[PDB]
mmCIF file of C-alpha atoms (C1' of nucleotides) in Angstrom:
data_model
loop_
_atom_site.group_PDB
_atom_site.id
_atom_site.type_symbol
_atom_site.label_atom_id
_atom_site.label_comp_id
_atom_site.label_asym_id
_atom_site.label_seq_id
_atom_site.Cartn_x
_atom_site.Cartn_y
_atom_site.Cartn_z
ATOM 1 C CA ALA F 1 73.344 2.019 56.927
ATOM 2 C CA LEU F 2 69.997 3.539 57.276
ATOM 3 C CA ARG F 3 70.457 4.438 53.612
ATOM 4 C CA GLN F 4 70.987 0.990 52.582
ATOM 5 C CA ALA F 5 67.715 0.258 54.368
ATOM 6 C CA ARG F 6 65.804 2.585 52.899
ATOM 7 C CA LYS F 7 66.737 1.458 49.484
ATOM 8 C CA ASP F 8 66.284 -2.342 49.895
ATOM 9 C CA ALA F 9 62.475 -1.491 51.455
ATOM 10 C CA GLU F 10 62.377 0.811 48.166
ATOM 11 C CA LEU F 11 62.417 -1.963 46.021
ATOM 12 C CA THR F 12 60.398 -4.544 47.119
ATOM 13 C CA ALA F 13 57.308 -6.923 45.733
ATOM 14 C CA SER F 14 54.610 -4.784 47.451
ATOM 15 C CA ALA F 15 52.071 -7.751 46.214
ATOM 16 C CA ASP F 16 48.525 -5.621 47.251
ATOM 17 C CA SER F 17 47.082 -3.129 44.658
ATOM 18 C CA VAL F 18 46.223 -0.357 46.976
ATOM 19 C CA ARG F 19 49.530 -0.297 48.915
ATOM 20 C CA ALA F 20 51.422 -0.176 45.513
ATOM 21 C CA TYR F 21 49.805 2.843 44.370
ATOM 22 C CA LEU F 22 49.873 4.417 47.247
ATOM 23 C CA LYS F 23 53.687 3.916 47.261
ATOM 24 C CA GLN F 24 53.923 5.137 43.770
ATOM 25 C CA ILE F 25 51.733 8.657 44.748
ATOM 26 C CA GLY F 26 53.292 8.939 47.508
ATOM 27 C CA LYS F 27 56.507 10.020 45.516
ATOM 28 C CA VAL F 28 55.984 13.447 44.535
ATOM 29 C CA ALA F 29 56.210 17.247 46.309
ATOM 30 C CA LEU F 30 53.196 19.289 47.322
ATOM 31 C CA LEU F 31 52.242 22.391 45.730
ATOM 32 C CA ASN F 32 52.258 26.111 47.020
ATOM 33 C CA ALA F 33 49.766 28.758 45.445
ATOM 34 C CA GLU F 34 52.205 30.663 43.226
ATOM 35 C CA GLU F 35 53.360 27.510 41.724
ATOM 36 C CA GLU F 36 49.894 26.245 40.644
ATOM 37 C CA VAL F 37 49.224 29.523 39.423
ATOM 38 C CA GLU F 38 52.735 28.960 36.935
ATOM 39 C CA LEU F 39 51.133 25.817 36.086
ATOM 40 C CA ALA F 40 47.938 26.967 35.133
ATOM 41 C CA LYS F 41 49.602 29.776 32.903
ATOM 42 C CA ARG F 42 51.597 27.108 31.493
ATOM 43 C CA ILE F 43 48.484 24.785 30.706
ATOM 44 C CA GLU F 44 46.644 27.684 29.166
ATOM 45 C CA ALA F 45 49.691 29.190 26.891
ATOM 46 C CA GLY F 46 50.386 25.506 25.810
ATOM 47 C CA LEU F 47 46.597 25.337 24.899
ATOM 48 C CA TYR F 48 46.560 28.580 22.871
ATOM 49 C CA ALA F 49 49.863 27.693 21.266
ATOM 50 C CA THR F 50 48.348 24.680 19.889
ATOM 51 C CA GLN F 51 44.873 25.721 18.681
ATOM 52 C CA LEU F 52 47.159 28.576 16.831
ATOM 53 C CA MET F 53 49.282 25.763 15.058
ATOM 54 C CA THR F 54 46.580 23.992 14.078
ATOM 55 C "C1'" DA B 1 -44.677 -22.960 1.164
ATOM 56 C "C1'" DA B 2 -39.502 -23.218 2.158
ATOM 57 C "C1'" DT B 3 -34.068 -22.333 1.430
ATOM 58 C "C1'" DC B 4 -29.254 -20.831 0.076
ATOM 59 C "C1'" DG B 5 -27.009 -16.928 -0.517
ATOM 60 C "C1'" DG B 6 -26.918 -10.970 -1.042
ATOM 61 C "C1'" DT B 7 -28.710 -5.658 0.653
ATOM 62 C "C1'" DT B 8 -28.446 -3.635 3.913
ATOM 63 C "C1'" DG B 9 -31.500 0.368 7.558
ATOM 64 C "C1'" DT B 10 -29.735 1.252 11.131
ATOM 65 C "C1'" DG B 11 -27.370 1.511 16.027
ATOM 66 C "C1'" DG B 12 -23.880 0.324 18.790
ATOM 67 C "C1'" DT B 13 -18.886 -0.400 19.328
ATOM 68 C "C1'" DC B 14 -13.817 -0.754 19.490
ATOM 69 C "C1'" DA B 15 -9.990 -0.120 19.475
ATOM 70 C "C1'" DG B 16 -6.199 2.524 16.957
ATOM 71 C "C1'" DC B 17 -3.845 5.673 15.632
ATOM 72 C "C1'" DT B 18 -3.356 11.172 15.677
ATOM 73 C "C1'" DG B 19 -2.725 14.977 17.388
ATOM 74 C "C1'" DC B 20 -2.159 16.919 21.467
ATOM 75 C "C1'" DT B 21 -0.953 18.263 25.639
ATOM 76 C "C1'" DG B 22 0.785 18.012 29.548
ATOM 77 C "C1'" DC B 23 4.320 16.342 32.493
ATOM 78 C "C1'" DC B 24 7.240 13.353 34.417
ATOM 79 C "C1'" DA B 25 11.524 10.559 34.167
ATOM 80 C "C1'" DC B 26 16.600 10.816 33.101
ATOM 81 C "C1'" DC B 27 20.841 11.996 32.045
ATOM 82 C "C1'" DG B 28 24.545 15.765 31.930
ATOM 83 C "C1'" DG B 29 26.998 20.027 33.906
ATOM 84 C "C1'" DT B 30 28.115 22.873 38.020
ATOM 85 C "C1'" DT B 31 28.755 24.454 42.707
ATOM 86 C "C1'" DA B 32 35.866 28.690 43.781
ATOM 87 C "C1'" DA B 33 37.526 30.833 52.425
ATOM 88 C "C1'" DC B 34 40.604 26.189 53.696
ATOM 89 C "C1'" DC B 35 42.205 20.586 55.181
ATOM 90 C "C1'" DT B 36 46.376 16.043 50.221
ATOM 91 C "C1'" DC B 37 49.216 8.227 51.050
ATOM 92 C "C1'" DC B 38 45.386 1.091 53.604
ATOM 93 C "C1'" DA B 39 44.224 -29.358 60.583
ATOM 94 C "C1'" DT B 40 47.021 -32.987 58.848
ATOM 95 C "C1'" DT B 41 49.863 -35.290 55.619
ATOM 96 C "C1'" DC B 42 52.243 -35.591 51.095
ATOM 97 C "C1'" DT B 43 54.315 -34.163 46.911
ATOM 98 C "C1'" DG B 44 56.837 -31.096 44.232
ATOM 99 C "C1'" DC B 45 59.159 -26.779 43.570
ATOM 100 C "C1'" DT B 46 62.697 -22.856 44.616
ATOM 101 C "C1'" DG B 47 65.643 -20.698 46.539
ATOM 102 C "C1'" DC B 48 70.434 -20.902 50.381
ATOM 103 C "C1'" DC B 49 74.596 -21.704 51.421
ATOM 104 C "C1'" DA B 50 79.100 -24.565 52.193
ATOM 105 C "C1'" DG B 51 82.574 -27.124 49.763
ATOM 106 C "C1'" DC B 52 85.786 -29.258 46.630
ATOM 107 C "C1'" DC B 53 88.076 -28.308 41.778
ATOM 108 C "C1'" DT B 54 91.011 -25.306 38.317
#
DNA sequence: AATCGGTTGTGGTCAGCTGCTGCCACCGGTTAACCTCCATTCTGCTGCCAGCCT
């Protein structure tokens, strides 16, 4: 169906480098502000943790 | 008398650093409303699908 026609186009050659990169990066959802805040807090916590550990 | 080499009185001179004193290229870091996907011809190889065989 449209499912199989989606998947057969989903795995293809794509022998152009720009098109291959754009297809690759268009596979992750965007973020909102509280999610960005959560990620930044996780980054800072992990960075202080590895400094403290070494 | 000259003649092949020294001494040098003295006056520029001429560039070679030496500071030196700016000063001017050159390179790195920063900026915090918000807005997220570009002609023709010949030859050889590689993949397609029917068609007999166990």
